[PDB]
Design a protein around this ligand. Sequence first.
Ligand SMILES: CNC(=O)c1cnn(C)c1Cl
Length: 115
Amino acid sequence: SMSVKKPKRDDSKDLALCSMILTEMETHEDAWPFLLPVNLKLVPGYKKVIKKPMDFSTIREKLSSGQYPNLETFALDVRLVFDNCETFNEDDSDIGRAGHNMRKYFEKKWTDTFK
Ligand SMILES: CNC(=O)c1cnn(C)c1Cl
């Protein structure tokens, strides 16, 4: 509260660290469904069903241009990608499997880097 501060968690390296995690996810061999925005004109259902589309290249642009106020807003966009994937894809499909695999991969890097 007013004039009562908890001690300052050092966040000075967060941009660099998030950029590294994003780079590792971009180069993962199962990242191919997630590299570019889904084509809303060519994929039936996607525009109507998926209210907030998200992908790694959009996350990369937003990170490079100061559009993430903090750590957590970045992690929310990464998870949005995999949450969208689960909504639209069967668990037993290539894209669906890629999604579960990438989420697991991300969450471990996230824990090891920041927790
Ligand atoms: C991330 N992409 C998807 O979820 C998807 C599912 N089917 N198609 C054609 C696409 Cl593109």
